[PDB]
Design a protein around this ligand. Structure first.
Ligand code: HEM
Ligand SMILES: [Mg+2]
Length: 423
C-alpha cells in the first residue's frame, strides 16, 4: 500500500497543549489560562503553564521530528503570545519564537502547517464578549494578517480555525470548555462571528497574495463523554442536536454563502442585532483551498477497544464526492494508558489504530479521494484540555517531572511507514 508522491507525513500539536511558558516573555493570558486556574474545571487541577515546555525545547523536539522523518508538522500560533490583548501592540519575543520554530522546521525539511486559532482566545478579548462580540472578528482579522505578514513568506499551509463546530458546542452549549456557556442563542451568535472571522482571514490572506493554501479544520464525528449527572448531559445533548442539525441542513449543508445569510437571519429572528456584511458571502462561496478532517472515532457507550477505521473511509468518500476539494487528515490518533518500562513504551494498540486508519485512507485514495496529507495526533503527550495530562496521545512520551522525551514504539513504526511511503 503505497501513498501519493508528495504526500504529507506529519504530526500535529497545539500551542496551549505543549508550549508552556504561559506567563513569560510578554505572553498574555488566554481563556484556557483563566479556565485551568479556576478550581474544578480541569482534571487533577492541571494547567498548561509548563505543559511540555516546548517554547524552550523546540530545537530538541524538531530534532525528534527529523528522526521520525516528518514531511510536515502541524502546530498552532498562540494568539495571546503574538497580541497579548488580542490586538494592538505585537509581542516581539512571541514573533521571535515562531520565526525560530519555522526556520528550524524548514532547516530540517519539515513543512509548517499552521493553525491560526486552536482555542486559545486572548482573555482580554473574552473580557469584552469573546466571539459574542463582533470586535473579536476585527481582532482576529488583524491577528491573521499579522501572522501572514511575519510568517507567510515561509508557511505554505494555513488553517483558520481548528474544529469551530466542536469549540462552539463545548464552550457555548455544554459549557465544559471556556467560556463555559450553556446557551444556544449565544452559540449561534458566536458561530456567526466565527464565520465572519474565517472569511476575513481568507480575504486578508488573498490580499497579501502569498503562494500558499488556506483552509479550515472540522471534526465531523465528535464524541462527548457522560459527565456525572445525567440531567445536564440531556440538556446539553439536546442543545447540541439543535445546533448540529442546523448546520447539517439537507439543502444548504456545505453552502456557507447561504449559511451566513440564514444564520444572520436566524439571529435576526430571535434577537435581531445584525451589522453590515462587506463581501463575506462571496468569499464564503469558495472559502477553502483544502478541508482538514480531524477523525478519532465514529457515531453509530464504547467498551474501550473499538476502533472505527471504516468510518474514516466513509467520511472521506462522502466529503470528496460532495465538495470536491483536497482533503488533509489534520488529526488522527488514540489515547493509551502509556507507561515507560525500561526505556520503552510498547503502545502496540496505538500502532494497530493508526495502521488500520491509514489503510482506510489508502482505500479512499485508491477510489479517487484526493487526500494530500496525514497528521498523527499527537507528536507528543500534552495538555489534553479539560482532561489535563491524564490522556496521552503522543507518538512520544513526555515525563512531565523531567520533561524527558521517549519515542514510543508507535514513533519507530511511523518512521518506517514514512520511509516506505506506505504500508
Ligand atoms: C464559524 C465556523 C464554522 C462553524 C461554527 C461550523 C459549524 C459546523 C457544524 C456544527 C457542523 C456539523 C457538525 C457535525 O457534523 O456534527 C458543520 C459541518 C460541516 N462544515 Fe461547518 N462550520 C464552520 C465553518 C465551515 C466552513 C467555512 C466550511 C466550508 C467552506 C465548513 C464546511 C463544513 C462541512 C463540509 C460540514 C459537513 C456537512 C455535511 O455533512 O455534508 N464549515 N459545521
Ligand atoms: Mg513491544
Amino acid at each position: 500500500l503505497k501513498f501519493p508522491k508528495d504526500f504529507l507525513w506529519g504530526a500535529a500539536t497545539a500551542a496551549y497543549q505543549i508550549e508552556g511558558a504561559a506567563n513569560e516573555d510578554g505572553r498574555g493570558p488566554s481563556i484556557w489560562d483563566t479556565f485551568s486556574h479556576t478550581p474544578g474545571k480541569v482534571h487533577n487541577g492541571d494547567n498548561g503553564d509548563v505543559a511540555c515546555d516546548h517554547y524552550h525545547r523546540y530545537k530538541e523536539d524538531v530534532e525528534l521530528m527529523k528522526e521520525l522523518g516528518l514531511n510536515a508538522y502541524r502546530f498552532s500560533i498562540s494568539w495571546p503570545r503574538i497580541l497579548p490583548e488580542g490586538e494592538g501592540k505585537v509581542n516581539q519575543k512571541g514573533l521571535d519564537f515562531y520565526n525560530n520554530l519555522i526556520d528550524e522546521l524548514l532547516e530540517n525539511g519539515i513543512e509548517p502547517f499552521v493553525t491560526l486559532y486552536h482555542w486559545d482566545l486572548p482573555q482580554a478579548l473574552q473580557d469584552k464578549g469573546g466571539w459574542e462580540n463582533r470586535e473579536t472578528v476585527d481582532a482576529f482579522a488583524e491577528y491573521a494578517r499579522v501572522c501572514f505578514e511575519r510568517f507567510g513568506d515561509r508557511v505554505k499551509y494555513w488553517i483558520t480555525f481548528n474544529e469551530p463546530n466542536v469549540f462552539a458546542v463545548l464552550g457555548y452549549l455544554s459549557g465544559v470548555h471556556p467560556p463555559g456557556m450553556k446557551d444556544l442563542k449565544k452559540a449561534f451568535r458566536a458561530a456567526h462571528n466565527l464565520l465572519l472571522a474565517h472569511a476575513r482571514a481568507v480575504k486578508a490572506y488573498r490580499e497579501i497574495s502569498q503562494n500558499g493554501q488556506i483552509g479550515i479544520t472540522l471534526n465531523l464525528s465528535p464524541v462527548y463523554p457522560a459527565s456525572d449527572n445525567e440531567e445536564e448531559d440531556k440538556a446539553a445533548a439536546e442543545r447540541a442536536d439543535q445546533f448540529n442539525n442546523w448546520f447539517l441542513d439537507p439543502i444548504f449543508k456545505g453552502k456557507y454563502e447561504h449559511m451566513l445569510e440564514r444564520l444572520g437571519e436566524q439571529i435576526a429572528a430571535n434577537g435581531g442585532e445584525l451589522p453590515e456584511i462587506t463581501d463575506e458571502m462571496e468569499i464564503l462561496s469558495a472559502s477553502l483551498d483544502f478541508i482538514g478532517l480531524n477523525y478519532y472515532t465514529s457515531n453509530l457507550t464504547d467498551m474501550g477497544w473499538e476502533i472505527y477505521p471504516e468510518g474514516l473511509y466513509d467520511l472521506l468518500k462522502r466529503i470528496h464526492e460532495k465538495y470536491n476539494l483536497p482533503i488533509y487528515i489534520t488529526e488522527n490518533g488514540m489515547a493509551v494508558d502509556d507507561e515507560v518500562e525500561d526505556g520503552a513504551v510498547h503502545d502496540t494498540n496505538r500502532i494497530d489504530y493508526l495502521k488500520e486508519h491509514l489503510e482506510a485512507v489508502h482505500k479512499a485514495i485508491e477510489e479517487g479521494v484526493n487526500v494530500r496529507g496525514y497528521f498523527v495526533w499527537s507528536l507528543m503527550d500534552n495538555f489534553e484540555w479539560a482532561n489535563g495530562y491524564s490522556k496521552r496521545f503522543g507518538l512520544i512520551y513526555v515525563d512531565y517531572k523531567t520533561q524527558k522525551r521517549t519515542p514510543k514504539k508507535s514513533a519507530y513504526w511511523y518512521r518506517e511507514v514514512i520511509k516506505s511511503n506506505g504500508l
